[PDB]
Amino acid sequence: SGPVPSRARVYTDVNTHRPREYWDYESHVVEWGNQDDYQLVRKLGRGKYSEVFEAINITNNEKVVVKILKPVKKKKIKREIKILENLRGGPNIITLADIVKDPVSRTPALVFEHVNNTDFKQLYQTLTDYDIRFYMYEILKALDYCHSMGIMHRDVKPHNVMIDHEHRKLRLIDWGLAEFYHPGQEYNVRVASRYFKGPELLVDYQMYDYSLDMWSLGCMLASMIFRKEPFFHGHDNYDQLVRIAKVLGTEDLYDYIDKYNIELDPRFNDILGRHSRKRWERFVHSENQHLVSPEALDFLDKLLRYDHQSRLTAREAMEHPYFYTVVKDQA
Numbered sequence: 001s002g003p004v005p006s007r008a009r010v011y012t013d014v015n016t017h018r019p020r021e022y023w024d025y026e027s028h029v030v031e032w033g034n035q036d037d038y039q040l041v042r043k044l045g046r047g048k049y050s051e052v053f054e055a056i057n058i059t060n061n062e063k064v065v066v067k068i069l070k071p072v073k074k075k076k077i078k079r080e081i082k083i084l085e086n087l088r089g090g091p092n093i094i095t096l097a098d099i100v101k102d103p104v105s106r107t108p109a110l111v112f113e114h115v116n117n118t119d120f121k122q123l124y125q126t127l128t129d130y131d132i133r134f135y136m137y138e139i140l141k142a143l144d145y146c147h148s149m150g151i152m153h154r155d156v157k158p159h160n161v162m163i164d165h166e167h168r169k170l171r172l173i174d175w176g177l178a179e180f181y182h183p184g185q186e187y188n189v190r191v192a193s194r195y196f197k198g199p200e201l202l203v204d205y206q207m208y209d210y211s212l213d214m215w216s217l218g219c220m221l222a223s224m225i226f227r228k229e230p231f232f233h234g235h236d237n238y239d240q241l242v243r244i245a246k247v248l249g250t251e252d253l254y255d256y257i258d259k260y261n262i263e264l265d266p267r268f269n270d271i272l273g274r275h276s277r278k279r280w281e282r283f284v285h286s287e288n289q290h291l292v293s294p295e296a297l298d299f300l301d302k303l304l305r306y307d308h309q310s311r312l313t314a315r316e317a318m319e320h321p322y323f324y325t326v327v328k329d330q331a
């Protein structure tokens with residue numbers, strides 16, 4: 001029969017009304033600079049294979065971050081560069097400063113503005129209830145902007161959120177998985193990190209949209225207010241949905257599958273079972289209760305929905321009572 005089609009309920013046609021060159025990144029011509037304008041100072045990497053470095057612009061002695069790109073198709077290099085140029089100057093979007101190639105190895109690298117980041121595994125333990133509301137609101141500014149610009153981030157997670165806590169500066173980074181939204185397009189479901197994958201990716205529903213980012217944001221919020229990182233801790237993609245189903249219940253999951261006529265992998269038949277939708281009070285205890293409030297639970301519940309159409313938009317999220325005090329202080 002086939003799956004039922006889907007369209008984003010906001011910013012549906014913003015790319016159609018753009019000139020072709022805005023979203024047709026395969027035709028984008030890159031102007032490569034010389035990496036000899038920057039001297040690498042220290043590896044900021046997280047693994048053996050990442051190539052992120054702190055560097056100095058020798059011309060003006062300003063601190064920057066150099067990301068040496070892994071060998072992927074030239075299309076994906078142009079896609080990330082075009083998206084970074086399209087979003088330049090947006091709220092809490094990382095600023096692309098330069099694009100260079102190593103003269104010897106001809107390896108392409110992206111140069112970004114420097115952020116004095118504190119890693120989330122050390123920062124989140126210290127965040128007050130107000131800090132979480134403040135930083136969630138800052139992420140929502142970046143998400144509403146890039147969604148309004150016809151772009152899905154598709155890899156929202158704490159590792160991709162740089163925070164200068166001293167200056168309360170937040171930047172959304174790592175746009176190498178980001179894509180342009182086009183109504184009716186079927187996208188690859190092998191995106192985002194496992195613990196932040198939306199149900200549509202896990203059940204192989206390809207006609208998704210910006211609301212994928214809002215599920216990932218819901219996973220971040222749940223880990224922060226409940227002090228459980230990550231919140232849905234699956235062992236693989238199949239077990240990831242099982243972890244979700246033990247919290248949100250299987251009834252809404254099978255309703256979601258029936259509504260879009262999604263063909264469920266036969267492996268999910270045995271492992272999913274039957275589970276009720278749990279109340280969020282079950283995850284509250286004396287170590288996290290100071291971060292949990294009725295406003296936080298109401299907001300979180302509206303992000304973590306199987307049906308991507310029923311999740312809050314970034315704009316709707318920014319108007320939730322959970323952020324009333326943050327909006328007041330900003331004005």
Ligand SMILES: NCCCn1cnc2c(Br)c(Br)c(Br)c(Br)c21
Pocket residue numbers: 044052065067094112113114115116117162173174175
């Ligand atoms: N844009 C891709 C993200 C790459 N990346 C990895 N770790 C990073 C750190 Br730490 C800082 Br600070 C900055 Br700025 C960037 Br950019 C980082």
